[PDB]
Each structure stands twice: as structure tokens, then as C-alpha cells.
């Protein structure tokens, strides 16, 4: 039970070099955040790792939701089951700047976290979404007021995030 091994960046933002799936299985948090696309297709990265850990139950539930909803908006979210990982999964769509989606929508994406007391989360709009990860962490720190536990799988990205956050003091 309980989050451990996090570096406290602000009063409400914590960060750890860890697999978000391993964190969820250890802690069983109320909310785990998925780094989603508008169609909630959980093919790769965080989304793939979460869906795999649910043995595809997350994808089947996502497909049912999108059939009633249509695609999410960029900057938008939905609350679905956290299945065996968490009580809830908050699927959030950050902007993909590779497709010329507006970086400002990254503010809208993180704003969704404020509807949840505590979240286990990845960094939004990094990897294939092509946003500057150091900017993403700044938007998170400036936008989120609830407790967020950031799980960053890649050691090199984690070290870059932590040392750039400390160097700006
Ligand atoms: N680091 C990292 C990643 C990632 C991929 C897979 C995982 C995982 N299993 N746990 C946590 N993080 N994680 O999260 C960010 C999401 O935009 C990107 O930088 C990804 O590369």
C-alpha cells in the first residue's frame, strides 16, 4: 500500500523513475492517468502498458465509450474503470505538436487532474506527441493543484526532468 520513493518537486507534485503499471499494482491508487489519443486506442507507450496489464479489458471498455461519445477533444478526458490497476482510469489527451495541435491545450489536459484528489500519472504530450518534456512538467506544476505522483519509466528523461527543475530553482 502507499506511494514511496517519490522526489517532492512542489507541495503537490511528486516524481519517481518507475513503470506506472508497477506503481499502480503496488499502491492500487484511486486514479491512474492514461496518456491517451482521441480514439482511446491503447497501442503503445503508457496506454499500451496499462491496457496490457488489464488483459485488454481497458481497450474493450474504451471502444464501448467511443461508440457512444465519438472521439475525445484534444485537451479533453474521460473517467473509465481502473480495472485491476486503480479504482478509476483518467484518460487524458494532450496535444500532439507533430500534427500542429496547439501547445496551449496542454494546459487544458492537465486541468482535468483538478477533478481528482490524488493521481498516479505520466508526463503528458511527451514521446510521440513531441512536446518539450521540461515544458510539460512546468505546465503540470503551474496548472495542477491536487496531489500528482508522476511515474517516468525512462531513466534519462527522469534525470533530465529532475536536474532541469532544480537548475531553474
Ligand atoms: N518515460 C516515459 C513514458 C512511458 C512509456 C511507458 C511508460 C510506463 N510504463 N510508465 C511510465 N512512463 N512510461 O511516459 C511518457 C508519456 O508521454 C513518455 O515520455 C513515455 O516514454
Curated annotation (Swiss-Prot):
Residues 1-169 form the Macro domain. Coiled coil: none annotated. It is found in: Host endoplasmic reticulum membrane. It comes from the Viruses. Inhibited in vitro by GRL-0617. It catalyses: Thiol-dependent hydrolysis of ester, thioester, amide, peptide and isopeptide bonds formed by the C-terminal Gly of ubiquitin (a 76-residue protein attached to proteins as an intracellular targeting signal). It is a multi-pass membrane protein. Changing residue 163 to L: In strain: Gamma/P.1. May form homohexamers. Interacts with N protein. Responsible for the cleavages located at the N-terminus of the replicase polyprotein. Participates together with nsp4 in the assembly of virally-induced cytoplasmic double-membrane vesicles necessary for viral replication. Antagonizes innate immune induction of type I interferon by blocking the phosphorylation, dimerization and subsequent nuclear translocation of host IRF3. Also prevents host NF-kappa-B signaling. In addition, PL-PRO possesses a deubiquitinating/deISGylating activity and processes both 'Lys-48'- and 'Lys-63'-linked polyubiquitin chains from cellular substrates. This is Papain-like protease nsp3. It comes from Severe acute respiratory syndrome coronavirus 2.
Amino acid at each position: 500500500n502507499s506511494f514511496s520513493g517519490y522526489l517532492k518537486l512542489t507541495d503537490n507534485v511528486y516524481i519517481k523513475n518507475a513503470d506506472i503499471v508497477e506503481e499502480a499494482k503496488k499502491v492500487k491508487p484511486t486514479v491512474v492517468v492514461n496518456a491517451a489519443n482521441v480514439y482511446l486506442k491503447h497501442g503503445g507507450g503508457v496506454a499500451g502498458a496499462l491496457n496490457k496489464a488489464t488483459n485488454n479489458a481497458m481497450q474493450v471498455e474504451s471502444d464501448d465509450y467511443i461508440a457512444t461519445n465519438g472521439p475525445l477533444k484534444v485537451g479533453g478526458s474521460c473517467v473509465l474503470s481502473g480495472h485491476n490497476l486503480a479504482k478509476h482510469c483518467l484518460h487524458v489527451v494532450g496535444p500532439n505538436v507533430n500534427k500542429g495541435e496547439d501547445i496551449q491545450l496542454l494546459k487544458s489536459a492537465y486541468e482535468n487532474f483538478n477533478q481528482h484528489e490524488v493521481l498516479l500519472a505520466p508526463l503528458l504530450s511527451a514521446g510521440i506527441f513531441g512536446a518539450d518534456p521540461i515544458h510539460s512538467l512546468r505546465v503540470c506544476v503551474d496548472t495542477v493543484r491536487t496531489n500528482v505522483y508522476l511515474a517516468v519509466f525512462d531513466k534519462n528523461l527522469y534525470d533530465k526532468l529532475v536536474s532541469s527543475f532544480l537548475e531553474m530553482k
